[PDB]
């Protein structure tokens, strides 16, 4: 048979990769960071509480100015906040109220959103007449939009429940590159600092590293036991952290091509909904289903702090580009800025 | 001129919060529903009786606004996108009365999901006319797929239409008891199940959803006052 021959060849290649990964595992990140000074206790306080959303918030994204931020709620609204003054800059009504993701362009001229409508919508914020209007609707996904991130004003990467990722040309509206290989719902993606690579997390307990220009999967990472819900790149671009429904966060390295650290605890039996790094990458902030956000020491896997201000499931969190504040969105319709 | 920008930002924020107050009236008045079905269940005919990833249907009953949503181009994996509907008034679960065992497993997953624990389910046991013709004929016995049907008796609290024979009443009430065993096993007062024997072309389906939604909102208000 050929099916049994192609399957048996997969077990041979999987054993070869598992042995190549075990050869490089000379030490553990816990052993090399066993002597460094821990960060103590990180006790952040709620500085701002952004109210105005009517339903659960599913996503938020900071602007590149570390002041403005966009948030998406399932009431059908995109609200752009001025986190310094808590004033609302824009309130964009959406065609489909089932939004699941949002993005802020690096230039600050565009915001994106999408969800169960299987469409990524682009909204121009600097139009001449002054009314925020949809600039482009990117159709082509056969599943719900789960995440989207701007490469520039004319490029965007999307992840959907159709088990694929896509790179779009906003002016034309066409998929320039389609990233296939996942066998489950792709839930999150994270762009590298140079925007030449991005990692995706799906419901197959696997994470993949994609090349944006070449459109190929370079590395496939395993280790999680359940669906990966969140993913974030390390500040340098040589590592990334994942949050899954197995109540664990795991740190993966690109050059070592394997997992380095597990961030878990016996009393945590709820899935992770969001992950983010600090400016230096020392703190790994994770949002959980138990309404809490835990601040992990990324180098030592120690719990360094807890953010317990929300009354419902924390759905999204994000750190500013200057590292001054952390924003957290939750199903209780509130956004909180922590310092 | 920093005071000129800070006053222009407060004026724009006041105009936004004025529009958000109007949107809160429309949002809090509309009752959102999720229509879920199975393989060849008949939900499309109920929608017909009043690319795209989700379909919306708006209708009014006694001046009350209803917004029913039907899933379109989504894969058969539901464990992720079904969490979006944790705040709907009710989930309309249409079942064609082994596709029946598959609907029971799907009903169990919806009933016991941690995010849908506070969401009620309006159960439409559809295709009751086709169930009668199959039982009256007698070609395929339900006992071959449900061995407990041979030991089942029609409950005394049943309300059979005087036209149908006890064989059809015993068959359709056994299927209802299969779903009620799931609902009564984990029903602690957060949510309830409203079963109905429906046909896809019935004009009573819209009134059934209205009456069940009024019961759900009533029980929600009674729970806020801790009366029930």
């Amino acid at each position: 048979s050929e099916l049994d021959q192609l399957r048996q060849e997969a077990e041979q290649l999987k054993n070869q990769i598992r042995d190549a990964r075990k050869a490089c595992a000379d030490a553990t990140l816990s052993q090399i960071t066993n002597n460094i000074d821990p960060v103590g206790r990180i006790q952040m306080r709620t500085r701002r509480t952004l109210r105005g959303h009517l339903a659960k918030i599913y996503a938020m994204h900071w602007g590149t100015d570390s002041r403005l931020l966009v948030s998406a709620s399932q009431d059908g609204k995109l609200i752009i906040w001025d986190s310094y003054t808590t004033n609302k800059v824009h309130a964009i009504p959406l065609r489909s109220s089932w939004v699941m993701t949002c993005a802020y362009a690096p230039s600050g001229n565009y915001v994106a959103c999408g969800g169960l409508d299987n469409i990524c919508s682009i909204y121009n914020l600097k139009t001449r007449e002054g009314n925020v209007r949809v600039s482009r609707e990117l159709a082509g996904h056969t599943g719900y939009l789960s995440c989207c991130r701007f490469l520039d004003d004319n490029q965007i990467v999307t992840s959907s429940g159709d088990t694929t990722c896509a790179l779009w040309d906003i002016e034309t509206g066409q998929q320039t590159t389609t990233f296939t290989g996942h066998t489950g719902d792709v839930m999150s993606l994270s762009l590298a600092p140079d925007t030449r690579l991005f990692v995706s997390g799906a419901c197959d307990a696997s994470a993949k590293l994609w090349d944006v220009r070449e459109g190929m999967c370079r590395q496939t990472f395993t280790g999680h036991e359940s669906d990966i819900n969140a993913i974030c790149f390390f500040p340098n671009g040589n590592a990334f952290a994942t949050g899954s429904d197995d109540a664990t966060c795991r740190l993966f390295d690109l050059r070592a091509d394997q997992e380095l650290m597990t961030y878990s605890h016996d009393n945590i039996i709820c899935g992770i909904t969001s992950v983010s790094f600090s400016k230096s990458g020392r703190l790994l902030l994770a949002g959980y289903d138990d309404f809490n956000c835990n601040v992990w020491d990324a180098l030592k896997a120690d719990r360094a702090g807890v953010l317990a201000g929300h009354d419902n499931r924390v759905s999204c969190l994000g750190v500013t580009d200057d590292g001054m504040a952390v924003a957290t969105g939750s199903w209780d319709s509130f956004l909180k800025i922590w310092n | 001129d920093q005071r000129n920008e800070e006053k222009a930002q407060r004026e724009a924020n006041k105009k936004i919060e004025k529009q958000l107050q109007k949107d809160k009236q429309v949002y809090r008045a509309t009752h959102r529903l999720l229509l879920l079905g199975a393989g060849e269940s008949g939900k499309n005919t109920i929608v017909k009786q009043m690319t795209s990833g989700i379909f919306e249907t708006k209708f009014q009953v006694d001046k009350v606004n209803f917004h029913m949503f039907d899933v379109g181009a989504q894969r058969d994996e539901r464990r992720k996108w079904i969490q979006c509907f944790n705040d709907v008034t009710a989930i309309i679960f249409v079942v064609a009365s082994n596709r029946l065992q598959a609907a029971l497993k799907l009903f169990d997953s919806i009933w016991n999901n941690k995010w849908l624990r506070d969401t009620s389910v309006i159960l439409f046991l559809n295709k009751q006319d086709l169930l009668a013709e199959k039982v009256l004929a007698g070609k395929s016995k339900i006992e071959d797929y449900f061995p407990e049907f041979a030991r089942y008796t029609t409950p005394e609290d049943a309300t059979p239409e005087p036209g149908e024979d006890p064989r059809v009443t015993r068959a359709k009430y056994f299927i209802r008891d299969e779903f009620l065993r799931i609902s009564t096993a984990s029903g602690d007062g957060r949510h309830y199940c409203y079963p109905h024997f429906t046909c896809a072309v019935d004009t009573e389906n819209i009134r059934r959803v209205f009456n069940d939604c009024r019961d759900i909102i009533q029980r929600m208000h009674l729970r806020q006052y801790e009366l029930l």
Partner: nanobody
Framework: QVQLQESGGGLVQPGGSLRLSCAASGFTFSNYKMNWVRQAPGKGLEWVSDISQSGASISYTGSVKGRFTISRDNAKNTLYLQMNSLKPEDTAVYYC?????????????????????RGQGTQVTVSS
């Protein structure tokens, strides 16, 4: 990596017995509810039996109740299915399916066309 490998299976006479074994690896076996699904020739995937984390709660589909017996050994990370008095209706590829999330009463999408936490399946044919 989550791995489910189904063993057993083969040709059996009508009325015979078979025992299927599911060797699990890559996850905490005690934290997940396990399932058995099968795909008959020219038919879709059909749920057969499931067992809770501890083994107390056990449910079967109607067509196999009284003939099939499911059991789990959390020490050996193995799922078992004892099939007695087999009929030609039981001819199918039997898959070992795991619930997606741990510590969950609900078990979604175990009978989906594409599901990650499911084995490749073992062939069971009942013919004379």
């Amino acid at each position: 990596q989550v791995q489910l490998q189904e063993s057993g299976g083969g040709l059996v006479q009508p009325g015979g017995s078979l025992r299927l074994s599911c060797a699990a690896s890559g996850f905490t076996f005690s934290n997940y509810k396990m399932n058995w699904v099968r795909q008959a020739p020219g038919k879709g995937l059909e749920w057969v039996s499931d067992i809770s984390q501890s083994g107390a709660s056990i449910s079967y589909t109607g067509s196999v109740k009284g003939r099939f017996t499911i059991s789990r050994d959390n020490a050996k990370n193995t799922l078992y299915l004892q099939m007695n008095s087999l009929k030609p209706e039981d001819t199918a590829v039997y898959y070992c399916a795991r619930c997606p999330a741990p510590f969950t009463r609900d078990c979604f999408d175990v009978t989906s066309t594409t599901y990650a936490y499911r084995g490749q399946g073992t062939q069971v044919t009942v013919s004379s």
